[PDB]
Amino acid sequence: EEKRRQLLKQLHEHETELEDERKQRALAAAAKKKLEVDVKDLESQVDSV
Amino acid sequence: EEKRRQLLKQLHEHETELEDERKQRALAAAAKKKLEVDVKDLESQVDSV
Amino acid sequence: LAQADWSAKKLVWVPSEKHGFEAASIKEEKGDEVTVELQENGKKVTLSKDDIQKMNPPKFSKVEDMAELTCLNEASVLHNLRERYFSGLIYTYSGLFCVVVNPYKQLPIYSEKIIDMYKGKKRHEMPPHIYAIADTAYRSMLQDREDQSILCTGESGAGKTENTKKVIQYLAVVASSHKGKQGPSFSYGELEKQLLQANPILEAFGNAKTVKNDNSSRFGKFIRINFDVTGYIVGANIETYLLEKSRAIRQAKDERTFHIFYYLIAGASEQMRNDLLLEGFNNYTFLSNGHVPIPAQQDDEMFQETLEA
Amino acid sequence: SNLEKKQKKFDQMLAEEKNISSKYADERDRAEAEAREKETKALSLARA
Amino acid sequence: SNLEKKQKKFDQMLAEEKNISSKYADERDRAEAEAREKETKALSLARA
Amino acid sequence: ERLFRWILTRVNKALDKTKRQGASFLGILDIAGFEIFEINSFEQLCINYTNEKLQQLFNHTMFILEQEEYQREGIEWNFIDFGLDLQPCIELIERPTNPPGVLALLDEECWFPKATDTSFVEKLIQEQGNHPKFQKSKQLKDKTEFCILHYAGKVSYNASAWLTKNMDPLNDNVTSLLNQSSDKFVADLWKDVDRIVGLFRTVGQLYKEQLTKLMTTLRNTNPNFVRCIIPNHEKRAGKLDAHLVLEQLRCNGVLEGIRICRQGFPNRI
Amino acid sequence: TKERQQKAEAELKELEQKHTQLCEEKNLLQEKLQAETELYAEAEEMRVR
Amino acid sequence: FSEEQTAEFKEAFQLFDRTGDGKILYSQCGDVMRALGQNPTNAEVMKVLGNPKSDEMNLKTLNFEQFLPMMQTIAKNKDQGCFEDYVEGLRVFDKEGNGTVMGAEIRHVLVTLGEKMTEEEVEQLVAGHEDSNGCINYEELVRMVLSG
C-alpha cells in the first residue's frame, strides 16, 4: 500500500505537470484559438478580395 | 514489490512520453496557428485599408 | 353525486381580480355568451365564450404532478399551486422541471431521515423535493458518464437563492465518501464542511437589502463540483461576477448595503475596533440612508458565524 | 373509452375476486402445513 | 386513458390462465408440504 | 472588486492538486434576479440582460432543441411553434455588424474622444428607434433616459454617467503607489495594474465575452431547470397575489412547457 | 550518514532555490517572453501595414 | 445428519458465543450458518426461526441442540442461485456489454433492491477490484464469491 501510495504521488505530480499547459491542460485552448483564428483569417481574406 | 516498482517505472515512462508529445504539439500549435494567422489577418486588414 | 354535478360544463373557473381566478357555476348559455353566476357570493353576470377554464375533478386536488392533469387550464394550475402552497408543499413537479415558491418561513423539510427517504428513489417515487431533483441529477450524472447542470431563476433571491445553498447542504452529505472519519448528521470531512461554509463565507459580501428583498445574491454565481468515477466529491470551484459597486459606495433609497459593513460595525472586538480606527453609524459619508435595523437578524451573530466559517 | 373502462372494471373485479380465494386458501393451507412441519421437526430433533 | 385500459385488458387476458396455473402450483406445493410433514411426524414417532 | 477577486481566488484555493480533474462534474447556476428600480443604472441593465439571456437559453433548450431533434430523427412530427423567443430582445443589445446593439453602441460612444450620456441616448434612439422591444422615453428623450421591454415587463434606465461606469478610469499614480505599498496584502490586492485606464478594453466586452463563454460551456451539458416564483412583493408569509403569479408563470412560459411533455416525447434512447 | 544528509539536505535547498529562480522564475520569464513576442509580431504587422 | 462434521460444527458454534456456553444470538447464528457455506436469505431464516421479530432476533439466542434441526431445514433447500444466473444477469445488467459492469450502479442496486444491506457491506465486497473505468469484471468477483 505504501509503494502504491508512492506511485500515486508520482502520478499526481505528473498529472499536475501535464495539467498546467500540456495536453488536456492548454492543448484544448490552443485548438480553440486556432479554430477561432482560422475563420477570422478567412473572413479577412474575403474582405480583402 | 519488484512488480510494483516496475509498474511505477512504466507509468513514469508513459507520463514522460505523453508530456513530451504534449509539449511538442503545444509548441507546434502555438508557433504555427497563432502568429501566422495573426500576420495574415493584419495583412488582410492592410489590404482592406 | 358531485361527479355528475360538475360533469356538466357549467361549474367551471372564471377570471377575476379578488383572487385572479375563482370558480363559478353557470345556469344556461346564449349563443356564445355564458350565463356566469358567482356560486361563492351570487354575482350573476353573463360573459363571453373564450373564458373556457374547465374545473378539474376535485378528486385530483393538491396533485403535485401537473403533467397528469386532465385539463391544463391556467386557472387550474394556479389553483393547484395555491393549495399546495397553503398545504405547506412548496416544491411541485411539472413535466420536466420543478417549481418552488419560498414562503419566507423555515419549513422543517431538512432532515437526515428526509435525506435517506429521498436518496436513491426515482422522481415520482417520492413527493416533490429539491433533494429529489438533486438525487435525480446525481443518478443521471453517474449513469451517462458525462456532466450535468442545474439552474435557478427568479427576481429577488430570498428563496430564489436559498434553494441553491439547500441543494449544497444536501449534496455535501448525500455523496460524501468515508475515509475513516436530524439534518446533515454524518461524520463529515474537511472539504464537506468547508464547501458548506463556502456559501456564507462569500455571501457575507455580495448580499444587501433592496427595496424588494433584504438578502440575496447581489451578483451571478456558478459552482462546479468535480467528481470521481466512483461518484465522490473530488473538487470545488466558484465563479462569481460583477458586484454592486453603486450600493457598495452609495447605497440606494433606504437600502442596506453589503452586510459585511454592518457586521463589522458591532461584530468586531472593541480592541480591534480601536486598532482599525473605526466608528459606529452616523459617522461615514458612505453611509447614505444611514443604518437600518435588519428584520429578525442581528449583526454580531452572523459576524461571528462568518468569522468561524 | 368510459364504456370500455366501466366494462373492464367489473371484469377485473370478478377476475381478482376469483383468483384471490384460489390463492388465499392455498396460501393459508401451505403456511399451516409448513408451520406444523417445522414444529414437528424441531421437537423431533430436540428429542433425538 | 385508452392506452392504460387496453394494457390492463391485454394483461388480464393472459393473467387469467396465469392465476389458474399459480393456484394449481400452490395447491401442489401445499399438498407436498403436508406429505413432508406427515413423513417427518412418522419419523418423529419412530425416533421418540 | 480586487478584494472580492482575491477572496474568490483564495476560496478556489480550497484544492488544486487535490482537485484532480474529474470526469462527471456538476454545474450549479444561481443568477441575480430580475429587478425593477426607480433608478436602474448600467449594472442593473447588465444583470437584467443576463436574466433575459438565460431565460432565452432555457426557452431554446426547452422547445427548439426538442422540436428540431424530432425532425432530425425523421419521426413524424409537425413543428408546433409556441411563439416564445427573445431573439430580437437579445440581438438589440450586441449585434455589431448591422446597426449596433446597445453594447456596441456604448463601446463606440465611450471610445469617442468627447461625448455625453445625452449624446449616447441620442445615438441609441436614432440607431434603433423603431425596434418592437424598444420604446423611447416618455416625452423626455432629452432627459437621457429610456425604457426597454423585456420578458418580465418594461423597465426604464437613466444613462447618467454610463460612459464613466463603463470606462472606469483611475489615477494611475495612486495605483502604482499602492502597488508598492508597505503591506504585502495590499500589494497582492494591487499586483495586476496592467490595463487600468487613466488617459484599454472596457467592461462591456469582457462581460459579454465571458458570459458567452459560460453559455457555451453550459450548452455542452445536459441541463436541468427549477424555477421559483414569489407569492407577492409583500415579503410576508401567508398571503399570495393572484395576478402576480399569473403573469409570472405566463412570461416564464411554463404552461407551454407542460404542454410539451403533454404532447412531445421527453425521452431519448 | 550525517555528511551525506548535508550532501542531500543542503542539496535539497539547492533544488528549492534553483527551482524558484530557475524553473518557476523560468516560467514567469517564459510568459514575459511570449507576451513580448506577440507584441513585437503586432508591431511588425503594424510596421508593414 | 452425522457426527462426522458435528465436531467442527460444535467448535464453530461455541467459537462465536458471547457467553461461552452454547447460546448465540439469532442474527449471530444465522451469520454462522452463512459462514458455514449454507447462506440462505434471511426470509427463509426467519421462516425456520419460528417467524420472530427483530426484537426477538436481537434478544433471543439459541442452543446447539435446536441448531441441528435448523441447519437440517437449511439443507432442505439443497441448492441456491446458480452461477450462470449471476453471470448472465450481470452481463445483461450493464449498459453496453463491455465485459464489465459499472460500480456505482452495482452498489446502488445492491443496497436498494430486495434484501437490504449497508453501504460498507457492498463496499468491502467490491473493494480491491475497483478500476479507473469504474467497470469491474463481474465474472472474477462472482466466481470468487461463489467459490468463496
Side-chain angles (χ1 to χ4, degrees), chain A residues 26 28-31, chain B residues 26 28-31, chain C, chain D residues 15 25 31 33 35 42 46 48, chain E residues 15 25 31 33 35 42 46 48, chain F residues 1-16 22-269, chain G, chain H:
Chain C
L1 291 203
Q3 299 95 24
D5 180 27
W6 43 248
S7 159
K9 317 303 294 299
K10 284 191 179 304
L11 296 87
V12 308
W13 312 115
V14 60
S16 68
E17 50 84 25
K18 183 67 222 65
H19 307 317
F21 278 88
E22 271 88 328
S25 159
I26 293 93
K27 298 303 117 184
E28 212 187 356
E29 206 287 325
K30 313 302 156 306
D32 62 326
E33 310 307 317
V34 285
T35 61
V36 176
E37 63 93 2
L38 180 49
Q39 46 78 51
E40 194 69 26
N41 291 319
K43 308 182 183 179
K44 160 70 203 71
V45 51
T46 313
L47 212 46
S48 88
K49 187 263 294 178
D50 200 71
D51 47 23
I52 40 168
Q53 304 90 15
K54 286 171 273 296
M55 189 272 286
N56 277 90
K59 55 172 173 50
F60 290 168
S61 44
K62 298 180 179 58
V63 57
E64 53 86 29
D65 196 329
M66 277 84 76
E68 76 206 24
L69 290 174
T70 74
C71 296
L72 185 69
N73 279 131
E74 172 75 23
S76 62
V77 300
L78 181 156
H79 196 80
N80 179 28
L81 267 294
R82 174 174 67 231
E83 288 101 20
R84 297 200 82 262
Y85 184 89
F86 278 154
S87 57
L89 319 178
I90 44 168
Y91 309 139
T92 309
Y93 279 137
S94 87
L96 279 296
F97 57 88
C98 181
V99 177
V100 52
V101 174
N102 192 36
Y104 297 71
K105 183 257 186 179
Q106 277 57 35
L107 271 297
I109 57 165
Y110 322 103
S111 86
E112 49 87 20
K113 66 190 180 307
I114 281 165
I115 302 292
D116 299 14
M117 82 175 80
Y118 279 162
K119 68 181 177 55
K121 272 74 53 185
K122 306 164 180 171
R123 178 195 179 191
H124 64 90
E125 300 302 325
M126 285 305 170
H129 199 282
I130 201 155
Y131 298 167
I133 180 65
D135 193 23
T136 55
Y138 195 78
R139 298 305 175 174
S140 45
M141 55 79 77
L142 61 90
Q143 171 63 254
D144 57 6
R145 304 169 283 215
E146 62 93 21
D147 66 327
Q148 290 308 301
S149 43
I150 187 171
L151 307 91
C152 171
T153 62
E155 53 280 346
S156 47
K160 284 78 72 177
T161 52
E162 311 162 351
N163 306 314
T164 41
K165 65 172 166 52
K166 285 310 177 183
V167 188
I168 291 303
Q169 169 179 345
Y170 166 86
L171 56 91
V173 303
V174 67
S176 168
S177 200
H178 45 285
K179 57 166 192 60
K181 310 182 172 85
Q182 301 284 151
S185 58
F186 157 74
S187 87
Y188 314 98
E190 308 88 359
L191 60 94
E192 282 80 357
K193 312 182 300 297
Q194 289 200 64
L195 71 93
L196 174 47
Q197 298 312 287
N199 205 64
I201 278 162
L202 58 92
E203 273 175 324
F205 306 85
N207 282 71
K209 175 257 182 189
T210 82
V211 308
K212 297 179 176 57
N213 182 12
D214 194 282
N215 170 40
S216 167
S217 316
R218 302 289 153 269
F219 54 92
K221 74 173 67 174
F222 175 77
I223 305 313
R224 170 190 187 92
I225 304 311
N226 293 318
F227 282 93
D228 73 327
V229 300
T230 78
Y232 281 132
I233 297 101
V234 304
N237 175 30
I238 297 94
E239 173 55 76
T240 183
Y241 294 133
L242 50 89
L243 280 297
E244 300 185 351
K245 306 165 261 287
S246 89
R247 327 259 304 282
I249 287 88
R250 196 263 180 263
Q251 303 82 353
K253 166 60 170 44
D254 302 1
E255 276 199 0
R256 147 187 312 263
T257 181
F258 282 40
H259 310 147
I260 180 59
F261 295 81
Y262 312 84
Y263 289 155
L264 180 149
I265 285 289
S269 88
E270 283 64 31
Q271 164 264 350
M272 91 176 309
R273 289 183 208 282
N274 181 272
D275 297 334
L276 299 196
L277 281 74
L278 291 155
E279 211 179 357
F281 315 121
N282 198 33
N283 307 303
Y284 302 98
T285 318
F286 279 169
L287 196 65
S288 68
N289 308 267
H291 160 250
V292 55
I294 170 163
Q297 303 300 326
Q298 306 311 307
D299 46 2
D300 43 355
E301 59 180 1
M302 268 167 290
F303 182 94
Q304 304 169 7
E305 284 183 351
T306 47
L307 268 293
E308 186 40 56
Chain F
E1 294 168 270
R2 291 164 99 84
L3 174 141
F4 201 86
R5 291 187 320 166
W6 182 84
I7 285 300
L8 164 74
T9 55
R10 184 49 202 266
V11 77
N12 290 323
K13 206 46 70 183
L15 73 163
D16 172 67
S24 161
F25 87 96
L26 186 76
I28 296 93
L29 199 148
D30 198 356
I31 200 61
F34 208 101
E35 85 297 338
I36 306 310
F37 284 1
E38 283 69 20
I39 301 97
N40 305 265
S41 171
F42 167 60
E43 181 188 347
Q44 282 66 24
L45 178 56
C46 316
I47 62 180
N48 292 282
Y49 151 74
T50 303
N51 266 314
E52 303 159 70
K53 200 173 193 176
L54 59 89
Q55 160 62 76
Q56 168 90 334
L57 178 139
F58 155 78
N59 204 297
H60 156 78
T61 57
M62 177 49 224
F63 306 89
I64 314 180
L65 279 194
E66 292 84 334
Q67 292 199 30
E68 50 194 340
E69 274 308 316
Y70 298 153
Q71 49 87 31
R72 251 194 313 279
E73 307 322 297
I75 69 169
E76 53 98 18
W77 171 253
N78 54 0
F79 188 97
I80 302 185
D81 175 29
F82 287 88
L84 264 187
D85 198 334
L86 303 178
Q87 185 61 220
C89 205
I90 297 194
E91 279 289 340
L92 53 83
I93 206 165
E94 45 196 1
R95 50 185 183 87
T97 174
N98 47 7
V102 191
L103 296 159
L105 284 176
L106 188 148
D107 294 2
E108 284 321 301
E109 158 86 350
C110 63
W111 267 10
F112 208 79
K114 172 57 63 184
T116 300
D117 308 333
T118 45
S119 87
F120 178 48
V121 160
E122 195 283 320
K123 289 173 52 184
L124 184 158
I125 63 185
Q126 64 82 39
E127 198 60 38
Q128 317 300 330
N130 49 23
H131 202 276
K133 299 297 183 182
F134 164 65
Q135 166 199 4
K136 75 178 182 182
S137 169
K138 282 85 177 177
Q139 94 189 8
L140 303 182
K141 56 166 58 63
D142 315 331
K143 274 70 179 182
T144 196
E145 66 93 6
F146 71 106
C147 60
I148 319 178
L149 293 170
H150 305 292
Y151 84 108
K154 176 249 297 182
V155 59
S156 45
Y157 296 103
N158 175 18
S160 158
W162 275 21
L163 63 93
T164 81
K165 270 197 54 188
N166 168 51
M167 186 75 66
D168 316 323
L170 278 81
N171 173 283
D172 51 50
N173 315 119
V174 301
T175 44
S176 47
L177 179 62
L178 274 293
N179 177 31
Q180 275 55 60
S181 185
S182 46
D183 169 66
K184 186 66 193 68
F185 184 44
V186 300
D188 305 323
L189 295 181
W190 300 82
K191 59 179 177 181
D192 195 10
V193 53
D194 56 330
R195 309 189 67 194
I196 294 90
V197 306
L199 286 84
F200 197 91
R201 196 99 168 283
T202 179
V203 309
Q205 311 104 354
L206 271 71
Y207 180 53
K208 65 167 172 52
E209 189 276 331
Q210 64 83 18
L211 167 60
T212 48
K213 182 265 291 180
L214 181 147
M215 269 186 48
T216 50
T217 53
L218 182 49
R219 288 190 323 279
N220 315 314
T221 296
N222 170 31
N224 197 328
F225 308 96
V226 63
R227 286 162 133 186
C228 179
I229 308 299
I230 192 170
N232 44 9
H233 302 96
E234 193 195 24
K235 212 191 304 188
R236 185 185 72 86
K239 205 200 173 56
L240 187 138
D241 183 287
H243 37 266
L244 198 61
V245 60
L246 272 156
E247 53 84 19
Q248 278 175 96
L249 68 93
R250 281 179 186 281
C251 54
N252 288 285
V254 305
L255 214 57
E256 294 180 325
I258 313 151
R259 267 185 204 81
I260 287 305
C261 45
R262 202 58 201 84
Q263 279 66 247
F265 292 73
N267 282 329
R268 279 83 61 191
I269 191 59
Chain G
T1 51
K2 283 190 291 291
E3 60 85 21
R4 192 263 323 280
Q5 299 308 140
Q6 279 77 248
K7 202 160 51 187
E9 307 325 297
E11 171 66 58
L12 195 53
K13 64 93 176 178
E14 287 160 359
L15 303 183
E16 165 70 279
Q17 59 173 341
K18 293 154 196 173
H19 204 280
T20 184
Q21 62 94 22
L22 287 180
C23 319
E24 295 299 325
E25 272 209 2
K26 168 64 182 67
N27 299 320
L28 311 178
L29 285 174
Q30 170 204 19
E31 292 183 41
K32 302 158 202 170
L33 267 295
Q34 293 307 130
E36 294 149 4
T37 48
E38 285 294 333
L39 266 297
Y40 165 68
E42 274 209 359
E44 188 83 21
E45 290 159 19
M46 190 175 184
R47 282 167 70 171
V48 288
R49 286 174 279 187
Chain H
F1 284 159
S2 68
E3 205 261 340
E4 200 344 278
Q5 66 282 355
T6 311
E8 296 80 359
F9 284 178
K10 269 277 288 175
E11 57 86 18
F13 184 80
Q14 285 98 62
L15 177 54
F16 276 32
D17 198 323
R18 319 280 72 78
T19 65
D21 56 67
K23 286 302 260 165
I24 291 90
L25 202 52
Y26 283 165
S27 47
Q28 292 184 329
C29 64
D31 192 77
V32 182
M33 278 298 306
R34 287 195 171 88
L36 290 191
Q38 291 74 238
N39 52 4
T41 308
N42 48 8
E44 54 270 32
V45 183
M46 309 329 171
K47 177 258 297 179
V48 298
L49 206 55
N51 289 293
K53 279 76 65 179
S54 75
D55 57 337
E56 179 79 356
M57 301 160 193
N58 58 64
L59 71 91
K60 180 60 179 55
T61 73
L62 187 76
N63 309 264
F64 188 75
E65 180 210 39
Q66 299 85 17
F67 193 68
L68 272 295
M70 250 302 263
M71 53 86 56
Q72 284 291 148
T73 74
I74 298 306
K76 300 311 169 183
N77 307 317
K78 312 170 200 311
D79 197 6
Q80 280 82 239
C82 279
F83 180 76
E84 87 277 343
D85 239 49
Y86 307 137
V87 292
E88 70 86 19
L90 289 230
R91 181 69 273 144
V92 306
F93 185 80
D94 186 272
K95 271 75 200 186
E96 71 282 344
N98 182 338
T100 44
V101 284
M102 304 181 184
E105 57 158 350
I106 284 307
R107 310 153 209 162
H108 161 265
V109 306
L110 261 291
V111 291
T112 70
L113 274 178
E115 166 62 31
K116 327 299 298 183
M117 299 90 59
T118 183
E119 59 92 12
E120 60 266 35
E121 179 162 348
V122 293
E123 263 296 331
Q124 286 100 28
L125 175 74
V126 65
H129 307 92
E130 292 90 317
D131 65 330
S132 66
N133 191 29
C135 295
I136 325 299
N137 175 271
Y138 71 98
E139 284 283 348
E140 57 88 19
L141 57 93
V142 68
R143 67 184 45 105
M144 158 262 297
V145 167
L146 174 80
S147 42

